[PDB]
Design a protein around this nucleic acid. Structure first.
Length: 95
RNA sequence: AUUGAAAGUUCAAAGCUUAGAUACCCUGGAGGGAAACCAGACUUAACACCA
């Protein structure tokens, strides 16, 4: 756990910022303006969130039947690059 | 009983192409195969005398 000034530099250095290219398939060179830049969040990163539920009978099924079987889901975009496989861990058993 | 409810910035995209670790460069200059060394040492034995 770093100070907020030093941590913001160390964290910004873990963020993956790549350039990406679209290639002219006939001459195998990059197109004009076929270069752009994207940002990814690395493997093993950990986001924390909460799922709040109102009192009902459907949520009892949802929290018991549905939420137990969510281990892996896919968030965000660029799934073709394989950029969405994420894992939920449900802080009620890891504690 | 909330200007509330509902809605995935999603999708397609190769950091690709061109590019000789090449060019100059005497293993050279200096350094005595020298220093020392007797071709020398010695007569013996037998013997007729002596004894």
């Amino acid at each position: 756990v770093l100070e907020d000034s030093i941590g913001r530099e160390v964290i910004n250095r873990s963020l993956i910022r790549v350039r990406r290219i679209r290639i002219d398939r006939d001459k195998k060179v990059v197109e004009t303006g076929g270069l752009w830049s994207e940002e990814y969040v690395p493997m093993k990163t950990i986001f924390f969130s909460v799922l709040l539920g109102k009192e009902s009978k459907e949520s009892a099924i949802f929290a018991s039947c549905i939420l137990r079987n969510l281990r892996y889901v896919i968030l965000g975009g660029k799934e073709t690059i394989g950029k969405g496989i994420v894992e939920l861990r449900w802080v009620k058993d890891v504690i």
